[PDB]
Amino acid sequence: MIVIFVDFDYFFAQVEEVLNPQYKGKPLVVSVYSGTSGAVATANYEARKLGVKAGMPIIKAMQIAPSAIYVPMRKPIYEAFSNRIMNLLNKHADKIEVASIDEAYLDVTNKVEGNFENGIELARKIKQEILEKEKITVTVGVAPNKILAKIIADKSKPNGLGVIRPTEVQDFLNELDIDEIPGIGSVLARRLNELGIQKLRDILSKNYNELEKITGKAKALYLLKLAQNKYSEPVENKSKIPHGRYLTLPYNTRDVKVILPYLKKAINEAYNKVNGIPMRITVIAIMEDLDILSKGKKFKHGISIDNAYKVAEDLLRELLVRDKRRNVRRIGVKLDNIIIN
């Protein structure tokens, strides 16, 4: 199995530089505020070094990057670029898994006839084409599985091209630092380091229960398997980017007879702006005081539109059997986990 992981380098910030060449070089920082009140969404490296990162309040960033160029967030533009690149990637693989607006996995075990050396060749052409047609740098990782593809990709960005051949696998995992593993909090890593866990292999030298009471069943199994490479999940041909259409009722109430008709229209519109069957459906109800109140359900197989109406109605019922004295002002639907192709 040959997996190619493609990650757009500080995407949101890099696009603004493509639309404003002059900014190229200076500490750019994509902001996300409203109402002041906001935070840092993205920032190129010329701004990262100055101590600016995502999640960091605009103020704290401004106080550490005054000369930094701050620009509001125009997601519709990023979305546009994202769609263009993702579809460009779709033709280069047997299966494509859109992890986010800037992350994707590709199984090319067939396009390269099972030749791992050609997967690197392809990942070279991919990295090239994106740069040509879109003027954007992406970091790529080429390894037997997703986790390895992503890990090597991080240790290689920006503009990098990480590679882990089938033979250098078990080796790579050994000298792999806990702090380089995705899914582990920077906090849980510090504690692990304090406990003597420096490399991923140090996990294969400690009572599992003694490891769970620190990490937890989830991450413990993940780390233990990862230290053996038994964490080789196939590349699902789907998209994890949410999509949902909301609608405002002719007047806010709790009358299912009035709400439902609109809930079904929201479902129809949500299905039109989607390229496949959703594996999860979430009914969102914007209540009189504008606060959100939702509930959803995930399915193995795809969820047909006719099933959507049924499932959605029950979800709507429940929300109403969970909140009283609160007419619904708006009602929408949010579809996720789309089974593409």
Q: Which residues are annotated as a binding site for Mg(2+)?
A: 7, 102
Element (H, E) at 337: none
Domain spans of the chain?
Answer: 2-10+75-163, 11-74, 164-230, 241-338
Give the CA count within 13 Å in the CB-facing half-sphere of 120.
11
CATH assignment, 241-338: 3.30.1490.100
Environment class of 168 (CB within 10 Å of its CB; exposed 0-12, middle 13-18, buried 19+)? exposed
Resolution (A): 2.8
Specify the DSSP class assigned to residue 150: H
CB 155 within 8 A of CB 36: no
Q: Is there a common fold for 2-10+75-163 and 241-338?
A: no
Q: How many angstroms separate the CA atoms of 64 and 108, rounded? A: 44
Give the three-state DSSP class for 127: helix
Q: 70-108 b/e with 16+ CB inside 10 Å = b?
A: bbebeeeebeebbeebbeebbebbebbbbbebbbbbbbb
* Domain 164-230: CATH class, spelled out: mainly alpha
As a whole number of angstroms, the distance between CA 265 and CA 249 comes to 11
**Nearest-CA neighbor of 108 among 157, 146, 155, 56?**
146
Annotated catalytic residue: which of 16, 46, 97, 103? Answer: 103
Helix, strand, or coil here: 266? helix
Binding residues: 7, 102
Residue 157 has φ and ψ, to the nearest 5°, of -80, 160
Question: Which residues are bridge partners to 69 per DSSP?
Answer: 28
Cα–Cα distance, 242 to 341 (Å, whole number) = 17
On whether the 2-10+75-163 domain is CATH 3.30.70.270, my answer is yes
CA distance linking residue 37 with residue 43, whole number of Å:
18
Strand positions, DSSP E, the chain: 3-8, 28-33, 38-43, 69-71, 95-100, 103-107, 138-143, 161-163, 238-239, 243-253, 280-287, 291-298, 328-336, 338-339
Decide: 139 and 155 in contact? Cβ < 8 Å: no
Which CATH number fits the domain 11-74, given the four candidates 3.30.200.20, 3.40.1170.60, 2.60.40.1930, 2.102.10.10?
3.40.1170.60
Is residue 269 flagged as an active site residue? no
Contact (CB, 8 A) for 269 and 288? no
Triad 38, 42, 47: Cα angle to 5°: 105
